[PDB]
Every structure is written in structure tokens, then in C-alpha cells.
């Protein structure tokens with residue numbers, strides 16, 4: 001028993017992190033097969049970052065302009081190209097620690113583990129969700145660019161995030177490993193802001209189920225609702241609409257606990273309308289929304305990798 | 306910016322996790338050099354749970370009664386010994402992935418990462434604190450015994466916890482890697498209960514300094530307090546006493562933010578009195594006490610967002 005915010009074990013990803021240096025800029029790279037992936041803004045001076053012409057700045061650059069360091073071994077760069085906002089550096093040595101892996105683009109509400117790195121060295125691991133506004137509430141300092149987010153399935157690492165920047169509110173924005181930003185952001189120094197976020201309804205419901213499974217039941221009640229009526233409540237409280245697909249995904253937890261999703265929506269409806277009356281759920285005074293239904297089942301099942 | 310429950314990268318520990326089986330019982334072991342460490346209660350059977358005599362149970366075992374499995378490879382046990390509540394199995398192969406490591410016994414309030422494992426296979430990583438009542442608030446299912454807690458400050462793994470059992474309130478108890486339990490607990494299934502737990506005051510203060518570092522001051526006030534008046538108030542909310550050691554430990558955070566420790570004590574006293582009036586601190590609506598001063602310095606910028 002117990003319920004904790006849990007990250008995937010990070011060892012398979014630790015063996016892929018390297019340090020990439022171009023000019024005065026050092027950040028982190030992901031070394032898979034014979035290619036190192038990192039943010040393309042590594043080629044930019046501070047002057048360039050105001051209005052960068054990445055095409056022109058890159059063709060200027062050459063292989064020898066890039067220093068890649070794996071531990072204390074220099075990787076010789078033998079090729080360089082761009083894919084969207086990611087720079088790809090071909091090196092002369094395939095990473096012998098390359099795990100089974102895929103590049104995956106995730107949807108808002110989905111969670112993943114972040115391996116925060118500095119100077120190519122893993123520093124910490126934590127769990128976070130892609131927010132509805134396409135930011136992540138990360139924990140990153142200067143030099144963290146190029147840190148990656150991932151999920152594991154058995155032996156396969158699914159890389160879904162590379163870190164590029166911090167927004168003025170302190171939240172974070174990045175790309176998938178193909179260099180496509182999450183959210184309406186660009187890799188230049190210009191006015192940019194997180195849009196108004198919403199709460200991830202299906203994940204709150206998932207966590208309410210986790211609470212019931214762990215013996216927290218005070219919020220349950222005799223009432224049920226409909227999707228239409230609940231979604232009017234959701235809109236009122238800046239919760240994401242609940243769809244039929246969300247209900248289907250929560251099916252397992254509904255069966256296990258005996259609380260139909262619309263039964264639990266009636267609990268959440270009341271929590272949104274009345275508050276928690278001084279009580280906590282799973283040790284929180286807020287409605288937690290960064291556990292997916294899968295996360296709840298995996299932690300309450302003991303899945304290993 | 307930002308602030309998260311941040312664990313250490315677990316790879317160095319992943320490469321030490323094995324499966325240990327004795328009889329019908331399977332759990333996790335820690336393979337360092339040519340020794341596998343696991344909970345000694347792997348040698349218990351159904352009848353042995355209330356009043357096991359581990360000396361008598363163990364003398365009946367040969368080396369080949371212990372099956373150790375590292376991934377797909379069966380390791381051969383060539384010796385065994387019991388140290389307190391840990392079994393040490395000598396194997397014929399030194400672990401080639403052994404990291405630099407040490408064994409440390411921690412004090413209540415200290416934090417560490419836990420690599421939850423099942424059948425020798427890692428499941429997930431999270432942060433925990435040793436509570437004042439010598440339990441931890443983990444996430445552990447059947448077969449998690451032998452999972453370990455650790456820190457990795459400066460490329461050396463400091464192992465500080467091995468999981469042995471779950472108490473009735475859902476919290477967890479275990480030992481250091483020398484097999485000595487944290488707290489008054491024993492590896493018997495006789496009735497045992499965690500003592501009333503308390504909040505780790507020095508850690509809450511560390512987390513309030515983190516919030517200031519990250520740019521939020523709304524909770525401060527114009528007051529100060531004596532250490533004794535602070536403790537007289539805080540203990541009425543079931544907070545642990547704050548000692549001069551704790552005050553000294555908070556020095557660096559006080560220096561970086563310009564807020565005297567006892568002035569941050571005054572703020573905490575008022576937070577306990579008032580609540581947050583619908584606000585949060587670093588994304589939480591409760592006062593968080595599982596970040597230590599060292600953890601805050603590890604994770605936060607050295608430059609306050611003034």
C-alpha cells in the first residue's frame with residue numbers, strides 16, 4: 001500500500017546523455033545509435049537568439065564546430081543536420097548503451113519522467129505531465145537544455161520530450177525528439193507566455209480511484225450524474241471536458257472499486273462545488289491531476305521493466 | 306525555476322538489483338561486489354512469522370537452498386551469514402556493475418530515493434523521508450522487500466534503507482544495510498504500531514526558503530521569535546522541536562535570501578495560525594516537510610529571484 005508520485009527507473013536513459021558544446025554554449029545531448037540529438041539553439045549566440053535564421057546560422061557551422069563529450073571521451077562529429085528544432089550530430093561511434101527505443105509524441109494530460117541533466121551528467125529524475133496548455137511544470141536551471149522526458153514499456157524507452165526553454169511564469173517548453181514543439185512556442189528570444197491552463201479531469205478521477213483503492217472514501221456519495229451535466233460543472237471550474245473515451249479508459253478502476261465513472265464524477269462535482277471541508281485526499285489538500293489512469297494501475301499493480 | 310520531489314538517477318542501483326528465493330519466498334536483494342544483501346525473513350515460512358528464531362532457521366539452510374537470479378543468470382551462492390536483520394549471501398561472481406558505494410545510517414528528517422523493485426526488477430523511483438517516528442511513507446506492494454533507499458551525492462551511492470515490512474496504517478519499516486531496524490520495530494508479525502508522527506520542522510523551513518528563492522514572499526511577516534517561543538507554539542501543531550543544530554543548518558539558505566532563520570520561524574508560526582487563504586506555496590496547499598535544507602540547495606538556483 002501507499003501511493004507516491006513515481007518516475008520510471010532512469011538507468012537506460014542515463015547511458016545516453018552526453019555533453020554538447022558549440023562556441024560558448026554547453027548543453028546536453030541524447031546519444032542513440034551513431035547520432036546525438038540536442039536543441040538547435042545551441043548554435044546561437046545571444047545576439048542570434050533575438051531573431052535567428054537557423055538555416056543560415058547552421059550552414060555557416062561545420063562538423064568541427066561541435067564538441068561532444070561522453071563521460072571523459074570525445075566523440076568525433078562526422079555529420080550535422082537539422083530536423084525542425086532539433087540538431088542531429090552524426091558521430092563516428094554508435095552508443096553501445098543504446099536501449100530499445102522509439103520517438104513518441106504525447107498528448108496533453110499524459111505523464112512522463114524527466115531526467116534532468118547538466119553538462120551531460122544526469123542530476124535528478126522526476127515525474128510530470130504535459131499540461132493542457134502544452135507546458136510542463138518542470139524543475140530546471142541554466143544548463144538543463146537538452147534534458148529529456150520518457151516512458152518505458154517493458155524494455156522499450158519511448159522518448160517524448162526534449163527541454164528547450166523556460167517561460168516567464170517559471171514553467172517549461174520543449175519539443176518531441178523530432179524537434180516539433182509542444183505548444184505555440186518558438187526557439188527565439190521573443191515575448192512568449194503560457195496560456196491559461198486547465199485541470200486534467202480524467203487524471204483527477206484516476207487519482208480519486210487511487211484514493212479509494214488506498215482506503216480514502218469520505219468523498220463518495222449516493223449520487224450519479226451525466227456527462228452533459230458534469231461537463232457544465234467542469235467548464236465552470238476550468239476543468240478539461242470529460243469525453244466518452246475518458247470514461248472507457250477509467251472502466252477498469254470503476255469495476256474494481258464499484259464506483260461508476262459517473263458515480264465518481266458526482267463526487268468530483270461536489271468537491272468542486274463545496275471544497276474539501278478541511279480534509280485531505282492521499283495526503284493532498286489539492287485535487288491532483290498528474291496521475292494518468294495507467295499510472296494508477298501500474299503503481300497499484302507493481303509493473304516492472 | 307520550478308520545484309519537484311526529485312529523486313537521484315537510479316541506474317547505478319538498478320544494476321545491483323537481483324531476485325532471492327528461499328523455499329516459496331521470493332524478494333529482492335542488493336548485489337555489491339561478491340555479496341548479495343537481503344532481508345533475513347526470506348527464510349521464514351507461514352508458521353515462522355510470529356516468533357521466528359532466525360539462528361535456528363538459518364542453520365538448517367545450505368548455500369544451495371538460496372537461489373539468486375541476476376536478470377537471466379543464476380548466481381551461485383558459496384557462503385552465507387546473518388548480520389542483525391540482514392542475510393549476506395556470498396556469490397561466486399562479483400557484480401561488474403558495482404558502483405562506488407558506502408553504507409550510511411540516517412537520522413529522522415533525512416531524505417533518500419527509493420527504487421521499488423519486484424522479482425529483482427525495478428518498477429519506479431520516488432523520494433521519501435525518514436519520519437520522526439522511524440517509518441517511511443512509501444509505495445510498496447507484496448514482494449517489494451529488499452528494495453533499497455539511497456542517495457548519490459558526488460558519484461557515490463550511499464545506501465541507507467532496505468525495505469522489510471508494512472505497518473497497519475500503511476506506512477513502512479526497514480533497516481540500514483547493516484541490518485539494524487530504524488525505530489523500535491522487529492521482523493516479527495506480532496502487533497506493532499508506528500508512534501504518533503510529527504512534522505519535520507527544519508524541512509518545512511527549508512521549503513519556505515525554497516519558495517523565496519524561487520520568487521514568492523507572500524507568507525513572510527514583520528515579526529521575529531525566540532527559539533523557545535517558536536518551539537512552544539509549533540509543538541501545539543505536532544511539529545518537531547527545532548534545535549540550534551537545525552538553525553545552524555539553515556544558515557546558508559538564510560544567507561542567500563537575507564531572511565534570518567528566526568524570522569522565517571515567525572512566518573511559519575503565522576502560517577500554522579492562518580492557513581494559506583486559498584494560496585499555494587511551490588504548488589502545494591499544505592506545508593511540505595520532505596525536502597531537507599541540503600535538498601533545497603541541491604535543486605534550487607544559487608541566485609534568488611528577488
Ligand SMILES: *[C@H](O)[C@H](CC(C)C)NC(=O)[C@H](CC(C)C)NC(=O)[C@H](CC(C)C)NC(=O)OCc1ccccc1
Pocket residue numbers: 001332346349354445446447448449450451469470471472473491492493494495496497498
Ligand atoms: C516483504 O516483501 C513484505 C513487504 C510488505 C510491504 C508486504 N514484508 C512482509 O511480508 C513482512 C514479513 C515480516 C516477517 C517482517 N510482514 C509484514 O510486512 C506484515 C504485513 C504484511 C503481511 C502485509 N506486517 C506486520 O506484520 O506488522 C506487524 C503487525 C502485526 C499485527 C498487527 C499489526 C502489525
Ligand SMILES: [Cl-]
Pocket residue numbers: 222223224225
Ligand atoms: Cl442521483
Ligand code: NA
Pocket residue numbers: 220221222223224263264266267
Ligand atoms: Na456518487
Ligand code: NA
Pocket residue numbers: 409410481482483485
Ligand atoms: Na549502520
